[PDB]
Coordinates of all heavy atoms in Angstrom, one line a residue:
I180 N 130.0 93.9 88.6 CA 130.0 92.4 88.9 C 130.7 91.7 87.7 O 131.5 90.7 88.1 CB 128.6 91.8 89.1 CG1 127.8 92.6 90.2 CG2 128.7 90.3 89.5 CD1 128.4 92.4 91.5
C181 N 130.6 92.2 86.5 CA 131.4 91.6 85.4 C 132.9 91.7 85.6 O 133.7 90.8 85.4 CB 131.0 92.3 84.1 SG 131.9 91.6 82.7
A182 N 133.3 92.9 86.2 CA 134.8 93.2 86.3 C 135.4 92.2 87.2 O 136.7 92.0 87.1 CB 135.0 94.6 86.8
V183 N 134.7 91.6 88.2 CA 135.3 90.6 89.1 C 134.9 89.2 88.8 O 134.8 88.3 89.7 CB 134.9 91.0 90.6 CG1 135.5 92.4 90.9 CG2 133.4 91.0 90.8
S184 N 134.5 88.9 87.6 CA 134.0 87.6 87.2 C 134.6 87.3 85.8 O 134.8 88.2 85.0 CB 132.5 87.5 87.2 OG 132.1 86.3 86.5
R185 N 134.7 86.0 85.5 CA 135.1 85.6 84.1 C 133.8 85.6 83.2 O 133.9 85.2 82.0 CB 135.8 84.2 84.2 CG 135.0 83.1 84.8 CD 135.8 81.8 84.6 NE 134.8 80.6 84.8 CZ 134.1 80.0 83.9 NH1 134.2 80.4 82.6 NH2 133.3 79.1 84.2
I186 N 132.7 85.9 83.7 CA 131.3 85.8 83.0 C 131.0 87.2 82.4 O 131.1 88.2 83.1 CB 130.3 85.2 83.9 CG1 130.7 83.8 84.5 CG2 129.0 85.2 83.3 CD1 131.2 82.9 83.4
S187 N 130.6 87.2 81.2 CA 130.3 88.5 80.5 C 129.0 89.1 81.0 O 128.2 88.5 81.8 CB 130.1 88.1 79.0 OG 131.4 87.7 78.5
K188 N 128.7 90.3 80.6 CA 127.5 91.0 80.9 C 126.2 90.4 80.2 O 125.2 90.2 80.9 CB 127.5 92.5 80.5 CG 126.3 93.3 80.7 CD 126.3 94.8 80.3 CE 124.9 95.3 80.5 NZ 124.8 96.7 79.8
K189 N 126.4 89.9 79.0 CA 125.4 89.1 78.4 C 125.0 87.9 79.2 O 123.8 87.7 79.5 CB 125.9 88.8 76.9 CG 125.0 87.7 76.2 CD 125.3 87.6 74.7 CE 126.7 87.4 74.3 NZ 127.2 86.0 74.5
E190 N 125.9 87.1 79.6 CA 125.6 85.8 80.4 C 125.1 86.0 81.6 O 124.2 85.4 82.1 CB 126.9 85.0 80.3 CG 126.8 83.6 80.9 CD 126.0 82.5 80.2 OE1 125.1 82.9 79.4 OE2 126.3 81.3 80.3
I191 N 125.7 87.1 82.4 CA 125.2 87.3 83.8 C 123.8 87.9 83.7 O 122.9 87.6 84.6 CB 126.2 88.2 84.6 CG1 125.7 88.3 86.0 CG2 126.3 89.6 84.0 CD1 126.7 89.1 86.9
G192 N 123.5 88.7 82.8 CA 122.2 89.3 82.7 C 121.1 88.2 82.4 O 120.1 88.2 82.9
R193 N 121.4 87.3 81.4 CA 120.5 86.2 81.1 C 120.3 85.3 82.3 O 119.2 85.0 82.7 CB 121.1 85.4 80.0 CG 121.0 86.2 78.6 CD 121.6 85.4 77.4 NE 121.6 86.1 76.2 CZ 121.9 85.8 75.0 NH1 122.4 84.5 74.8 NH2 121.8 86.5 74.0
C194 N 121.3 85.0 83.1 CA 121.2 84.2 84.3 C 120.4 84.9 85.3 O 119.6 84.3 86.1 CB 122.6 83.7 84.8 SG 123.5 82.8 83.6
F195 N 120.6 86.2 85.5 CA 119.9 87.1 86.4 C 118.4 87.0 86.1 O 117.6 86.8 87.0 CB 120.4 88.5 86.4 CG 119.4 89.5 87.0 CD1 119.2 89.6 88.4 CD2 118.7 90.4 86.2 CE1 118.3 90.4 88.9 CE2 117.9 91.3 86.7 CZ 117.7 91.4 88.1
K196 N 118.0 87.2 84.8 CA 116.6 87.1 84.3 C 116.0 85.7 84.6 O 114.9 85.6 85.1 CB 116.6 87.3 82.9 CG 116.6 88.9 82.4 CD 115.2 89.5 82.6 CE 115.1 90.8 81.9 NZ 115.2 90.7 80.4
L197 N 116.8 84.7 84.3 CA 116.3 83.4 84.6 C 116.2 83.0 86.0 O 115.3 82.3 86.5 CB 117.3 82.4 83.8 CG 117.1 82.5 82.3 CD1 118.3 81.9 81.5 CD2 115.8 82.0 81.8
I198 N 117.1 83.5 86.9 CA 117.0 83.3 88.4 C 115.8 83.9 88.9 O 115.1 83.4 89.7 CB 118.3 83.7 89.1 CG1 119.4 82.7 88.8 CG2 118.0 83.7 90.6 CD1 120.7 83.2 89.3
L199 N 115.5 85.2 88.5 CA 114.3 85.9 89.0 C 113.0 85.1 88.6 O 112.0 85.0 89.3 CB 114.2 87.3 88.5 CG 115.1 88.4 89.1 CD1 114.8 89.7 88.4 CD2 115.0 88.4 90.6
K200 N 113.0 84.6 87.3 CA 111.9 83.8 86.8 C 111.7 82.5 87.7 O 110.7 82.2 88.1 CB 112.1 83.4 85.4 CG 111.2 82.4 84.8 CD 111.5 82.0 83.4 CE 110.4 81.2 82.8 NZ 110.2 81.6 81.3
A201 N 112.8 81.8 88.0 CA 112.8 80.6 88.8 C 112.3 80.8 90.2 O 111.5 80.0 90.6 CB 114.2 79.9 88.7
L202 N 112.9 81.8 90.8 CA 112.5 82.0 92.3 C 111.2 82.6 92.4 O 110.7 82.6 93.6 CB 113.6 82.8 93.0 CG 114.7 82.1 93.6 CD1 114.3 81.2 94.8 CD2 115.5 81.3 92.6
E203 N 110.5 83.2 91.3 CA 109.2 83.8 91.4 C 109.2 84.9 92.4 O 108.3 85.1 93.2 CB 108.1 82.8 91.7 CG 107.9 81.8 90.6 CD 106.9 80.7 91.0 OE1 106.4 80.8 92.1 OE2 106.5 79.9 90.0
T204 N 110.3 85.6 92.5 CA 110.5 86.8 93.4 C 110.7 88.0 92.6 O 110.7 88.1 91.2 CB 111.6 86.6 94.3 OG1 111.7 87.7 95.2 CG2 112.9 86.4 93.7
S205 N 110.9 89.2 93.1 CA 111.2 90.5 92.5 C 112.2 91.3 93.3 O 112.4 91.0 94.5 CB 109.9 91.2 92.2 OG 110.0 92.2 91.3
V206 N 112.7 92.3 92.7 CA 113.7 93.2 93.3 C 113.3 94.6 93.0 O 112.7 94.9 91.9 CB 115.0 92.9 92.8 CG1 115.6 91.6 93.4 CG2 115.1 92.8 91.3
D207 N 113.7 95.5 93.9 CA 113.3 96.9 93.7 C 114.1 97.5 92.6 O 115.2 97.1 92.3 CB 113.6 97.8 95.0 CG 113.0 97.1 96.3 OD1 112.3 96.1 96.1 OD2 113.1 97.6 97.4
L208 N 113.5 98.5 92.0 CA 114.1 99.3 90.8 C 115.1 100.2 91.4 O 114.9 100.9 92.4 CB 113.0 100.0 90.0 CG 113.4 100.8 88.8 CD1 112.1 101.0 88.0 CD2 113.9 102.3 89.1
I209 N 116.3 100.1 90.7 CA 117.5 101.0 91.1 C 117.3 102.5 90.9 O 116.8 102.8 89.8 CB 118.7 100.5 90.4 CG1 118.4 100.6 88.8 CG2 119.1 99.0 90.7 CD1 119.6 100.0 88.0
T210 N 117.6 103.3 91.8 CA 117.4 104.7 91.6 C 118.8 105.4 91.5 O 119.6 104.9 92.2 CB 116.7 105.3 92.9 OG1 117.8 105.7 93.7 CG2 115.9 104.2 93.6
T211 N 118.9 106.5 90.8 CA 120.2 107.1 90.5 C 120.7 107.5 91.9 O 121.7 108.3 91.8 CB 119.9 108.3 89.7 OG1 119.1 109.1 90.6 CG2 119.2 108.0 88.5
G212 N 120.3 107.0 92.9 CA 120.8 107.5 94.2 C 121.7 106.4 94.8 O 122.8 106.8 95.3
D213 N 121.3 105.2 94.8 CA 122.1 104.2 95.4 C 123.5 104.1 94.8 O 124.4 103.9 95.5 CB 121.4 102.8 95.3 CG 120.0 102.8 95.7 OD1 119.5 103.8 96.4 OD2 119.3 101.8 95.5
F214 N 123.6 104.4 93.5 CA 124.9 104.2 92.8 C 125.6 105.5 93.1 O 126.5 105.8 92.2 CB 124.8 104.1 91.3 CG 123.9 102.8 90.9 CD1 123.3 102.9 89.6 CD2 123.9 101.7 91.6 CE1 122.5 101.8 89.1 CE2 123.2 100.6 91.2 CZ 122.5 100.6 90.0
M215 N 125.4 106.2 94.1 CA 126.0 107.6 94.2 C 127.2 107.5 95.2 O 128.2 108.0 94.9 CB 125.1 108.7 94.7 CG 124.3 109.3 93.6 SD 125.3 109.9 92.3 CE 124.0 110.7 91.3
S216 N 127.0 106.9 96.3 CA 128.1 106.9 97.4 C 129.3 106.3 96.8 O 130.3 106.9 97.0 CB 127.6 106.2 98.6 OG 128.7 106.3 99.6
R217 N 129.1 105.3 96.0 CA 130.3 104.5 95.5 C 130.9 105.4 94.4 O 132.2 105.7 94.5 CB 130.0 103.1 95.0 CG 131.2 102.3 94.6 CD 130.7 101.0 94.1 NE 129.4 100.7 94.8 CZ 128.3 100.6 94.1 NH1 128.3 100.5 92.9 NH2 127.1 100.6 94.8
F218 N 130.1 105.7 93.4 CA 130.7 106.4 92.2 C 131.3 107.6 92.6 O 132.1 108.2 91.8 CB 129.7 106.6 91.1 CG 129.1 105.3 90.4 CD1 128.0 105.4 89.7 CD2 129.8 104.1 90.6 CE1 127.5 104.3 89.0 CE2 129.3 103.0 90.0 CZ 128.1 103.0 89.2
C219 N 131.1 108.1 93.8 CA 131.7 109.4 94.1 C 132.9 109.2 94.8 O 134.0 109.4 94.3 CB 130.9 110.3 95.1 SG 129.6 111.2 94.3
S220 N 132.6 108.3 95.9 CA 133.8 108.1 96.9 C 135.1 107.7 96.1 O 136.1 108.2 96.2 CB 133.4 107.1 98.0 OG 133.3 105.8 97.4

């Protein structure tokens, strides 16, 4: 996501943390599986 944005990894990570806090929601933990179809193809 950083590579297609003018916004750094530091800044997008902080905003991600703060958005999750604000919306009071949660997201599933990433498994070394989902990142496989792309990194391979």
Side-chain angles (χ1 to χ4, degrees):
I180 307 294
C181 182
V183 296
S184 169
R185 63 173 198 89
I186 299 311
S187 296
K188 181 183 172 191
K189 171 163 52 76
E190 179 75 332
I191 189 180
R193 288 174 185 189
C194 301
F195 162 73
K196 278 283 196 64
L197 294 166
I198 288 171
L199 285 185
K200 169 186 191 139
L202 272 296
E203 293 179 353
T204 180
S205 199
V206 288
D207 306 359
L208 181 163
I209 58 183
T210 92
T211 63
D213 307 352
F214 300 152
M215 278 304 181
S216 181
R217 186 180 335 120
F218 294 164
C219 276
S220 64

